[PDB]
Amino acid sequence: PKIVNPQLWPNPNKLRFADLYKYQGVEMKKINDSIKNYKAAKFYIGGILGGCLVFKFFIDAAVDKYIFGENGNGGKFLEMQTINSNYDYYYNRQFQRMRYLTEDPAGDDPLQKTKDEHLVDLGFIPKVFGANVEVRKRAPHDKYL
Amino acid sequence: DFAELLRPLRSLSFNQVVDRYVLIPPNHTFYRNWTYEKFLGGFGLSYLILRELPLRNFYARVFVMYAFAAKVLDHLGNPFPFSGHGQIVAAADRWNHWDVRCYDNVMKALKYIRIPTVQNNIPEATRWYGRQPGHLLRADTYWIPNLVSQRFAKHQPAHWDGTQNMPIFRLADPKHKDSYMVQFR
Amino acid sequence: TLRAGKNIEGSGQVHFGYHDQKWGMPAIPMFQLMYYELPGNSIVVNPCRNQNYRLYFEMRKKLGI
Amino acid sequence: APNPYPNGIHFDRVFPTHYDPLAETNRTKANLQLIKYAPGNYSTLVVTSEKLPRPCIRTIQNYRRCQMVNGTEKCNSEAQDILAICPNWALDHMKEKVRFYTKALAINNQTYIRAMQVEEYNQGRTVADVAPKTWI
Amino acid sequence: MNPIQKAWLKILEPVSYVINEKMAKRTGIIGKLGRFFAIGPREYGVHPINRMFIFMNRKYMAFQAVALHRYSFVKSLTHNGFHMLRVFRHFAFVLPATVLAGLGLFVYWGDDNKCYSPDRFPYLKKRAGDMALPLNSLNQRTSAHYIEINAIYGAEMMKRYHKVWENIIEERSKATDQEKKTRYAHPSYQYSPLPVVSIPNVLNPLNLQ
Amino acid sequence: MQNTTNIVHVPVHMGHTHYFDYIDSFPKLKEGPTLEENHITNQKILREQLISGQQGLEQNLCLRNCFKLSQKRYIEFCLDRKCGGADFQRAATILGYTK
Amino acid sequence: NSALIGSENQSDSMNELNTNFSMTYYILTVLPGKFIYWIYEILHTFFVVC
Amino acid sequence: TYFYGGILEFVYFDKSNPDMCILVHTLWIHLLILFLIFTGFVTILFSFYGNPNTEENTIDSDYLAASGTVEAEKEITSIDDYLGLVFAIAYVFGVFFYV
Amino acid sequence: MDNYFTAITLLGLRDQNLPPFKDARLQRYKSIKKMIDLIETTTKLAPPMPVELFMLNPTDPEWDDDMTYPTITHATALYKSSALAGNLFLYAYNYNNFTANIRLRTMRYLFPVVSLAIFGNIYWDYRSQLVKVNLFDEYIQARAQELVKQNEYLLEHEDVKRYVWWYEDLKETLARVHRQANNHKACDFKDSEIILQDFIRRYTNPKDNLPIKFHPQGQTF
Amino acid sequence: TSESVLAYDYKLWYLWSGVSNLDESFDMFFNQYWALSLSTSVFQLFYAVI
Amino acid sequence: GPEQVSPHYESFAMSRKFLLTFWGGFFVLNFGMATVDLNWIMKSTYIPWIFWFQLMYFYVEGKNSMFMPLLQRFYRRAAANEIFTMEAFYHENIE
Amino acid sequence: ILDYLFLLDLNDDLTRKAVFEQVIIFIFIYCTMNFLAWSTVVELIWP
């Protein structure tokens, strides 16, 4: 396309100064060489995309085989394996029971709880209980850990 | 106008309203985030076109790119990398966080701003739930003993015993005998 | 921690008081062979979650699907 | 996004700014050396509750079920399972709920007494003395 | 120069006439503005990113040719072609296999591309607004079955309550004021009539169905 | 108080290793049957339940679903309405809730 | 924090929704306006003190 | 709450719900940034396109590579074979020199 | 400042304007003090209804599965597809070398094998995720309809009718409440106290030690 | 933890403004029953209690 | 790109030493204001700083006045300096 | 259709080995290292 020239200065003569006009051409020449590679690669890229289209139908049947199995009850998707020995497994279960029985000291802030002085003035005189010194904390079944 | 907001409801019965607007059949296959990918991704596509402006003066295009960067920084915020996050205000719908509604700690982190008390501590219930160890994969190539030893380990089928907490891997705890080399900081 | 309800005076992890500090791993091969940082991508959902799909396969056969 | 509801809580950095949320229409942005505003630009005050552990819930359901079927006198073992399996923080939460609802019960009943108190201008008046008038 | 720059020139042809022909050759502020925004071929219009790719592509490709152009391990087993004693023949396919694995360098980048990310811990931190969570957050979860099944169950039971609700309101409309105040009343309550007032019986205050 | 302070109710044993701190063992930790031995054990229980424990199951499931209600008066309504008019104490003995 | 590299001041408006009611294209309209007033403040000061 | 809940606590309910947008083009930009960093690593330390006699970076790398390949005259085996093993071995003992 | 709309309505701000002087205005604020205690008490007399009506019991052992949400990582599949397309461009850009230079024969021969294996992984994950989402959607719909037909009978209990009759009694009572005077005194709702006290006396026993008794399904807030 | 980090990220904000009729955060009940209680009716006080 | 030829009479750095000093300290303060835990980074860097400097002192600097010179890198500079000189006289030698 | 195609799975790789996700990291590093080393040797025959 034509480029509008403000004509603020005269351009150098092309015959006297030829090097000043060459860069634009060699730049588009590089792109033309790249397009020759893009066009020549149509069958190679298309053959791969065609293979993916055929591979798509085998992957569909393999996923349903992987998930549903032979008789629709579940395939290898339901399988899970491990490298833990029998001791490693029962160590982890006891580690779960230990963390269940791992508490922090002091509990919560008592000042954020209902005061006994407030209950008296509200009409309910609270009864003082003793500490339950006979109960032993234990871990629940493994299904709850 | 308050009666105009209820126009699509006056022609329907209650059963039709519930089936129309409440009991939308579940379909979690849509790419809902394509709206954001198209919008924010347009900045990159616009740059591909804008980087070819025939403005002869280099410093003229410096002004154009600066103006275009001003449009992006209204969302991105911090121009430096690894510094912050962009800010986009999105619409509130029933499908916000739809795939993480199961997790409780995600809800507490998003919704609740707890008030610290005089006894300045995390609530004891929260600390107790946090000590129940998470599951950490046994596969590890970062420790050179496991990188060698696990090449001779035999993966045995872990038969399901009816629970959801089978510790078939190691536990994400600094005191676990298989995780002590991991730095929990 | 602040959002969880614990106000924080000061900053950092160089505890001035009676607490254990955990400096960064010394960037020397001795400590780099004994330790490695916790990879968050290794904390996973327990695979027993996949056993809930057994309910789907049984419901499909009950409904004649 | 709307202007956050006016909040006087702020934290100074270099000098006391005497921040007044009612002095300006739009809240000025927080500069690092000037001020930090309170958390929750868009937040309200609610009441929440922690969820007791699942094994602790199961022991409570076992006690209540065994209570309505066999009576309280034959539920000591189920009561001991609650004290043993439920973590101590859960038992402290269970103990505090009873004390709160005891307080709320006395407050609701004091409102009852003030409401049901017959004033001096309503002595001897019953529903027969009410005029046949509605809100309009 | 590239075709995208030529496409800009066709569209900016009227703009090029206003700036270059008219504004550029004037004087004053209008002249300075036109000469500054003159339209044409770009000064310093080279794209370094495009040039960065061409360089790294050519440099990495020359490495592929060296690593892939190896003497066969299989052909050296018979001691009949070009190789009698090759004590490191078992290393011949390590460089080619390494280069072929580089094809998935960008396909598998980061953690999310090597696994199902929603089953990993970092996905939870992203959905919480890039916020730190306890390491066992993936375990303390309510059943997704409950959340979705209860949402459907509640709305389905609301439609059946609406039908029962209509039959109760209609049946209570035909009830005497004595009956609607003594039924479901406390046993200690003695009924005393109120003056008869006119109060409409509106099902839905908003004109809904 | 030290931020890393825990109170544990069961005995633990710490490792006497340099540069590391962890629980290496639990005192008197007995290993039960393996995951495979437990699986075979459960298959035998599930097999007998599949072959010989499916008759009259619909009635017992209704009694179980009724007893998961909040109030007793709703349980009695569930038993009378859905379970063919069963008795509260009689169904509680079937399910094994009676002492 | 929008001008800091790797800010750790997470409680200083970093994790908040911060919108404004000024002109958009901030670094093009509002921020240059603050620098235009800054140049005036120092040019007026130089003229007065000198 | 009374039977299966904890204490009623007052918290501030954040109405703003943040969520990191899982996008595609953000990783493209991230790769472009790491590509600039890796190219700068190659541009400074692995660029041998200039004066090979004045740039000490190519003087060191050229003469060092030539001193290694000339050791093929020691008659160990095909240098084309074990040259890749030298590079891997250089990262075992090169830990001493922080390579 | 709770019971805002009730207090504003009792003051008459819905139909008129307050007196412009602080004396009569501040007396009018204190005049609704008795009525607020009455209306607060009425709202705490609602009879209970089955909680298993519009909400499944979350403590049911059925929900111990702790099932997660199966999702499709659209962004991951789209990125890896573009990275695979980037490899196809890298081959096309360098077609002449990969095709004619024999030193790159192994890339020419095994590029499609790696590309198919890469596509195989991208589509496998997408296809498997799609199957799991469809299995999840069809189960929650089928299971929900089974639980509806199982608990439909609970709507036939009389507690539902007792609950609605109480609500309609409150509506008719609050409609009869009216302002009687404008003396800015508590006696401006003189007849309304008798109406609301008769409502409270209708569902409670005033001559008890605790007229409002606590039950786990009661009204506190 | 230490995982993959991106150089630039965007954070969405599903703001519950309650003043936008474009999304599901618009409380239709509060506005309809508040506007209903503004008009003079016999149930004007009952709507305030609801 | 090609050699970035400057048309000025002084270099850019020497003409803006005051201004570059401002932005240099601005980004130092920027990092310092952003890094709340800079003392933790300093202490975590102490061991590797001591270790790598005491381990590599001899091979970098100590060799120049102690047991062995290790002149391998110098030999390559001297060979290049002679090749540079030969290229400088390529015209005379070939003529 | 065959079970050999199950090797394309990465959603449930944590159920079997979870080793693929870490080994390829070394392979990508190993290719980067050999790229820097081999290109230096072959290119630097030109001086």
Ligand SMILES: CCCCCCCCCCCCCCCCCC(=O)OC[C@H](COP(=O)([O-])OCC(O)COP(=O)([O-])OC[C@@H](COC(=O)CCCCCCCCCCCCCCCCC)OC(=O)CCCCCCCCCCCCCCCCC)OC(=O)CCCCCCCCCCCCCCCCC
């Ligand atoms: C045949 C001969 C010619 C005859 C025809 C001649 C007439 C042609 C015109 C009609 C045909 C046009 C075809 C498309 C139909 C569009 C219709 C329409 O209504 O669009 C209005 C359209 C959108 O209006 P909008 O709602 O305001 O959105 C823009 C906002 O900025 C948005 O801001 P935002 O913040 O709200 O959102 C950010 C935004 C991202 O937005 C941005 O970031 C851009 C910001 C601009 C830079 C900032 C500086 C702004 C400076 C202000 C002053 C600008 C003045 C510019 C005036 C330009 C006049 C057009 O991201 C997105 O929202 C999504 C973006 C992703 C969209 C997907 C891309 C699909 C595009 C089509 C693809 C196929 C076309 C071919 C490929 C392209 C050509 C190579 O207006 C524009 O045109 C915007 C300018 C875009 C640049 C146009 C360049 C492409 C022109 C192609 C011409 C043909 C190719 C060359 C052929 C040569 C041989 C013949």
Ligand SMILES: CCCCCCCCCCCCCCCCCC(=O)OC[C@H](COP(=O)([O-])OCC(O)COP(=O)([O-])OC[C@@H](COC(=O)CCCCCCCCCCCCCCCCC)OC(=O)CCCCCCCCCCCCCCCCC)OC(=O)CCCCCCCCCCCCCCCCC
């Ligand atoms: C139905 C469809 C239509 C059917 C009909 C049409 C199709 C007909 C055929 C079409 C063409 C087929 C192409 C092959 C036939 C070509 C005939 C020929 O003359 O070619 C000569 C041809 C000429 O040489 P060249 O052109 O100069 O260069 C060739 C290559 O560029 C590179 O050449 P290279 O020699 O340098 O490559 C060497 C490389 C070649 O790559 C391989 O073959 C991979 C080999 C890995 C397996 C090694 C197994 C070791 C022994 C295991 C024993 C038990 C096995 C149990 C297996 C159970 C599996 C779970 O092998 C190695 O690297 C050997 C060293 C391995 C490292 C050390 C491992 C051993 C020590 C560790 C022991 C650990 C255990 C110790 C204790 C044991 C307990 C006592 O050389 C070839 O062999 C060409 C093969 C190249 C691959 C072609 C692939 C094409 C794509 C097709 C799909 C894949 C098919 C193959 C899959 C194999 C399974 C992985």
Ligand SMILES: CCCCCCCCCCCCCCCCCC(=O)OC[C@H](COP(=O)([O-])OCC(O)COP(=O)([O-])OC[C@@H](COC(=O)CCCCCCCCCCCCCCCCC)OC(=O)CCCCCCCCCCCCCCCCC)OC(=O)CCCCCCCCCCCCCCCCC
């Ligand atoms: C701070 C800013 C941040 C903003 C973010 C964005 C940053 C900028 C990014 C810029 C880099 C990307 C450039 C994109 C286009 C921009 C326009 C442009 O190229 O510059 C003007 C460019 C001129 O360049 P120049 O700088 O002025 O001078 C060039 C020199 O003289 C010498 O000439 P030359 O030809 O030798 O120079 C080549 C030149 C430009 O060469 C080009 O032609 C650009 C081609 C780029 C295509 C990239 C892959 C896309 C594959 C096609 C997908 C199409 C899907 C369509 C679906 C529906 C249809 C079935 O450089 C490049 O090749 C740039 C490529 C960058 C590397 C990309 C490699 C990715 C592999 C790593 C994976 C990473 C994952 C992300 C992958 C994302 C993929 C979406 O204009 C042209 O080249 C005109 C080309 C006209 C013929 C091409 C017709 C289309 C053929 C497409 C290739 C087909 C391949 C096989 C299909 C594969 C899929 C099935």
Ligand SMILES: CCCCCCCCCCCCCCCCCC(=O)OC[C@H](COP(=O)([O-])OCC(O)COP(=O)([O-])OC[C@@H](COC(=O)CCCCCCCCCCCCCCCCC)OC(=O)CCCCCCCCCCCCCCCCC)OC(=O)CCCCCCCCCCCCCCCCC
């Ligand atoms: C939102 C608010 C925030 C944003 C606000 C905006 C702020 C933007 C800031 C940007 C400021 C404007 C940018 C102008 C250009 C950059 C400034 C500059 O000095 O360049 C002129 C200067 C040369 O200017 P010249 O006078 O025209 O050159 C004449 C001769 O040809 C030169 O060579 P000669 O030997 O023939 O002549 C003597 C030569 C003697 O000086 C030298 O030649 C330096 C020798 C070092 C080269 C030895 C090899 C080491 C470098 C190898 C490559 C590493 C990078 C690639 C590898 C990794 C790939 C990622 O020059 C001198 O007399 C003294 C030079 C200046 C004083 C020392 C400079 C120290 C600070 C600058 C370097 C920063 C390094 C990174 C630290 C920052 C953390 C990332 O450029 C350089 O020396 C290299 C710097 C290249 C730019 C990279 C840094 C950009 C940002 C710098 C900002 C200011 C420093 C901030 C940190 C200060 C820490 C103490």
Ligand SMILES: CCCCCCCCCCCCCCCCCC(=O)OC[C@H](COP(=O)([O-])OCC(O)COP(=O)([O-])OC[C@@H](COC(=O)CCCCCCCCCCCCCCCCC)OC(=O)CCCCCCCCCCCCCCCCC)OC(=O)CCCCCCCCCCCCCCCCC
């Ligand atoms: C065979 C080699 C030696 C093997 C012995 C074991 C290894 C040596 C350990 C102790 C080191 C002290 C000796 C300095 C050696 C410096 C050589 C050197 O670094 O190369 C410089 C050299 C060029 O640099 P240069 O500056 O010209 O070298 C001259 C020196 O600067 C200095 O100029 P120069 O002319 O004086 O050097 C001549 C060389 C002469 O060496 C010989 O001719 C060897 C002697 C004859 C053979 C004796 C060994 C017999 C072995 C068979 C018996 C074994 C039995 C085992 C059991 C039987 C098994 C079946 O050195 C000596 O003169 C040794 C005399 C020591 C003076 C002792 C005075 C009393 C000192 C008391 C205080 C000691 C404090 C020490 C503190 C702790 C140590 C740091 O580079 C090369 O030659 C490259 C090729 C490598 C040559 C072959 C490998 C030899 C080891 C080189 C180190 C690794 C290079 C390869 C990796 C490069 C990076 C990728």
Ligand SMILES: COC1=C(OC)C(=O)C(C/C=C(\C)CC/C=C(\C)CC/C=C(\C)CC/C=C(\C)CC/C=C(\C)CC/C=C(\C)CC/C=C(/C)CCC=C(C)C)=C(C)C1=O
């Ligand atoms: C095959 O053999 C091999 C080579 O060949 C020898 C190699 O060179 C190499 C080395 C690889 C390289 C040198 C490449 C390095 C590249 C890296 C590290 C990352 C590159 C990243 C970028 C260039 C950033 C690009 C940025 C973006 C894509 C985001 C902004 C762009 C947007 C939003 C456009 C939206 C995209 C589309 C619509 C897709 C459609 C595609 C198009 C081309 C349409 C373009 C449309 C227009 C209007 C221009 C390897 C590894 C190899 O294996």
Ligand SMILES: CCCCCCCC/C=C/CCCCCCCC(=O)OC[C@H](COP(=O)(O)OCCN)OC(=O)CCCCCCC/C=C/CCCCCCCC
């Ligand atoms: C992007 C790379 C292109 C080339 C790919 C080559 C490699 C081939 C290997 C691909 C393997 C396929 C794996 C599966 C990918 C799954 C794709 C996916 O998840 O997104 C699809 C998803 C479907 O949307 P839903 O209906 O919501 O979901 C329903 C699901 N059943 O698609 C989308 O969301 C649309 C966005 C996809 C990309 C769009 C590309 C846009 C480019 C614009 C240029 C076109 C010109 C536009 C001009 C406009 C004129 C008006």
